[PDB]
């Protein structure tokens, strides 16, 4: 049985920027059990049916975890724009896998705001697909260097979400987990 | 190069209604904060309203709460004030401008850089 | 909110200095001190930010300093060209979030 609590159940997530990844490789996945396991607020599949998932077998499924705005789960799907698709965290337009996700605002939200979960607001150009930026280089908006430090037309690349409990709805922190059902090579991760 | 193409203003009675909007190219729009000044004729700047890149923040000079909306559309590359309750003591020239901003981050604000052209607003009974 | 002269006047070829004084929750408590200049119907221009910085060329004449609650702009070598509005400014990380001054008339006697 595929340990998905290692990825679900982690007591710190990854900012999104600098989103974890783990392998997930010879276990049977039981989607039903993991999907009764929680309250998940999110749970929706590409290219595949998410109620035909435990007849399903793949050759490696790689669990991506990050925190987002409940209001930024919308991107994480194939053929969005944002600055969390386009700069954080970028699906191909053909992903194959599930996208879930629940409000952790008990979890990762603090008094007076938690500063520690970022985001990338500056790229010279949107992210291929599974690429990972974690660069903190000054963003050169214009003609003059930057030296390292901000400026004019020279920005820190990266932004804080300010989470606090009292935070509307979709400006609460939310744990994402992106299933990618990979197949290439014998088959090591099947349904029951 | 930056442009800020400001558009809306003119004559309105005092209670009417305006909507300015600014539309932005030349940088990539919804990375940055954008501000709103105006200047009475005359007179010196006044700073009106900023908001955040995401909308996730916008504030206001007291003597608009409640009567002027910043709002922004990133797909549009446009930043918007929609003023109501307008009074004569709004009379102003009015400026979108690019920054005016703050980051959390390592408390660094950057200045109001890039301006739009100006517009004029005029509430007279 | 800040305070500067209404205007000053300068010689051709001469340095011209204009002082803007704010509090402790603005000049004084930030480095975020800002010079636009403004030319009869046109839009303000940045021509120091962050006290002394200059973002272009364009400032090369403009230099800023800091000392208390008391910021000031310095031009050099005064061209008739440069008579304009000079405005200070300086973020609060509060409403406003940014003061500015009244605005300074530069003349340059001709």
């Known amino acids: 049985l595929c340990p998905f609590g290692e990825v679900f159940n982690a007591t710190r997530f990854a900012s999104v920027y600098a989103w974890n990844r783990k392998r997930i490789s010879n276990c049977v996945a039981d989607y039903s059990v993991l999907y009764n396991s929680a309250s998940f607020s999110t749970f929706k599949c590409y290219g595949v049916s998410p109620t035909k998932l435990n007849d399903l077998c793949f050759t490696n499924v790689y669990a991506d975890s990050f925190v987002i705005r409940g209001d930024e789960v919308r991107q994480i799907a194939p053929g969005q724009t944002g600055k969390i698709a386009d700069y954080n965290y970028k699906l191909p337009d053909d992903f194959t896998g599930c996208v879930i996700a629940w409000n952790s605002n008990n979890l990762d939200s603090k008094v007076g705001g938690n500063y520690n979960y970022l985001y990338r607001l500056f790229r010279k150009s949107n992210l291929k697909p599974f690429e990972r930026d974690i660069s903190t280089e000054i963003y050169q908006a214009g003609s003059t260097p930057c030296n390292g430090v901000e400026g004019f037309n020279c920005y820190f690349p990266l932004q804080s979400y300010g989470f606090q409990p009292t935070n509307g709805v979709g400006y609460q922190p939310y744990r994402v987990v992106v299933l990618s059902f990979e197949l290439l090579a014998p088959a090591t991760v099947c349904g029951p | 190069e930056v442009q800020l193409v400001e558009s809306g203003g003119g004559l309105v009675q005092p209670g009417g209604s305006l909507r300015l909007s600014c539309a932005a190219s030349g940088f990539t729009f919804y990375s940055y904060w954008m501000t709103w000044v105006r200047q009475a004729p005359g007179k010196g700047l006044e700073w009106v309203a900023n908001?955040?890149?995401?909308?996730?923040?916008?504030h206001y000079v007291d003597s608009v709460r409640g009567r002027f909306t910043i709002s922004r559309d990133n797909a549009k590359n446009s930043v918007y004030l929609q003023m109501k309750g307008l009074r004569a003591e709004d009379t102003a020239v009015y400026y979108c401008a690019r920054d005016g901003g703050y980051n959390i981050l390592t408390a660094y604000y950057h200045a109001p850089s890039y301006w739009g052209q100006g517009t004029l607003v005029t509430v007279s009974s | 909110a800040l305070t500067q002269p209404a205007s000053v006047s300068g010689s051709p070829g001469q340095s011209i200095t204009i002082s803007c004084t704010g509090t402790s929750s603005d000049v004084g408590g930030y480095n975020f001190v800002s010079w636009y200049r403004q030319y009869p119907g046109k839009a303000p221009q940045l021509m120091i930010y962050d006290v002394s910085r200059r973002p272009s060329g364009d400032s090369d004449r403009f230099s800023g300093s800091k000392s208390g609650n008391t910021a000031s702009l310095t031009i050099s070598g005064l061209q008739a060209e440069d008579e304009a509005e000079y405005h200070c400014?300086?973020?609060?990380?509060?409403?406003?979030?940014?003061?500015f001054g009244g605005g300074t008339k530069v003349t340059v006697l001709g």
């Open positions: 908001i955040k890149h995401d909308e996730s923040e916008s």
């Open positions: 400014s300086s973020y609060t990380g509060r409403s406003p979030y940014v003061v």
